[PDB]
Amino acid sequence: GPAPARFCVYYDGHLPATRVLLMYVRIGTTATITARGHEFEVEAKDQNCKVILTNGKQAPDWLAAEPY
Amino acid sequence: GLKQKIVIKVAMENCRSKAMALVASTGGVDSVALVGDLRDKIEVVGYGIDPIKLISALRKKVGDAELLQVSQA
């Protein structure tokens, strides 16, 4: 079976045909995303690739992630 | 050892997604972002990344790529 995903891949949007690719972030690290003229510091926690702000607050609805 | 930042301009006019996944799969990479107005540049952050091998793989598999920046920032 496949190895565990090593990255979370962040998008602006939920639909494959329209979403915009933003960043790959290594699972176990934090990174700053730039999107719609703002900065979002995320933690890629695990292979579920929940969008998680490092400050514990709720991220915008349009910010999505999935494992790679 | 030292945290790197590397920016590469890549000709990718599918091609962006391919380029980005190749970079993510490179040794030492912690993050990969598309940057620039035209979203034609890749910013790579991490540790012990080999930029020479990275540029030749991009040129090999994706298209013309050139180093814009390398900084141990």
Residue numbers in the entry:
A (entry chain B): 18 to 85
B (entry chain A): 186 to 198, 201 to 260
Show the paper's wording.
M. oryzae secretes a large repertoire of effector proteins, and many of these, including the structurally characterized AVR–Pizt, AVR–Pia, AVR–Pik, AVR1–CO39, and AVR–Pib, share a conserved structure comprising a six-stranded β-sandwich known as the MAX (Magnaporthe Avrs and ToxB-like) fold. Here, we reveal that Pikp is able to trigger partial disease resistance to the “mis-matched” effector AVR–Pia in rice and elicits a weak cell death response in Nicotiana benthamiana.
To visualize the interface formed between Pikp–HMA and AVR–Pia, and compare it to that with AVR–Pik, we purified the complex between these proteins and determined the structure to 1.9 Å resolution using X-ray crystallography. Pikp–HMA comprises two adjacent α-helices opposite a four-stranded β-sheet. Previous structures of AVR–Pia were determined by NMR spectroscopy, and the crystal structure determined here is very similar (0.92 Å over 65 aligned residues), comprising the six-stranded β-sandwich characteristic of MAX effectors. As observed previously, a disulfide bond is formed between residues Cys-25 and Cys-66. Whereas Pikp–HMA binds AVR–PikD opposite the face of its β-sheet, it binds AVR–Pia adjacent to α-1 and β-2. The interface formed between Pikp–HMA and AVR–Pia covers an area of 460 Å2 (as calculated by PISA), approximately half of that seen between Pikp–HMA and AVR–PikD (986 Å2 (12)). Intriguingly, although Pikp–HMA binds AVR–Pia at a different interface to AVR–PikD, it uses the same interface that RGA5–HMA uses to bind AVR1–CO39 (29).
